[PDB]
Design a protein around this ligand. Sequence first.
Ligand SMILES: [Zn+2]
Length: 153
Amino acid sequence: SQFDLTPPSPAQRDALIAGLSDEEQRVLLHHGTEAPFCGVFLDNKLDGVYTCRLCGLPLFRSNAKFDSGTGWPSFFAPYDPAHVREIRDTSYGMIRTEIVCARCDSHLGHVFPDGPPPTGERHCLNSVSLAFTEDGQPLPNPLQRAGAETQPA
Ligand SMILES: [Zn+2]
């Protein structure tokens, strides 16, 4: 990855959190308390990139030509596998795993084992956790990181 996955500094984290709505804070900053959501993402242009609502990291690409299968919302694919972390917890075991932002550790969703082959995985993403950048538009880059993050995704 050309992105710097170093977490936000404490000051940066405070600033970004200060910009979140109550609903956004409920979703992004908590783990294991809220009901899962499997967003369908019907409200944006097909061609762009979903970013972590907290830290701006590009997470999921959508494109009219993508065909990742029925375990993902229509037209979705991972932006970079390094950008999300899957978490297994003995509280759930094989029932579900949590998906978090690899940079800021904010809650993104869950993976359930009831998806299509070959992975058998269903990616259940909370739309509140994600912002959208249309193709051609520079990434939000709230951390003001140099390099790829200064460009369109
Ligand atoms: Zn993040």
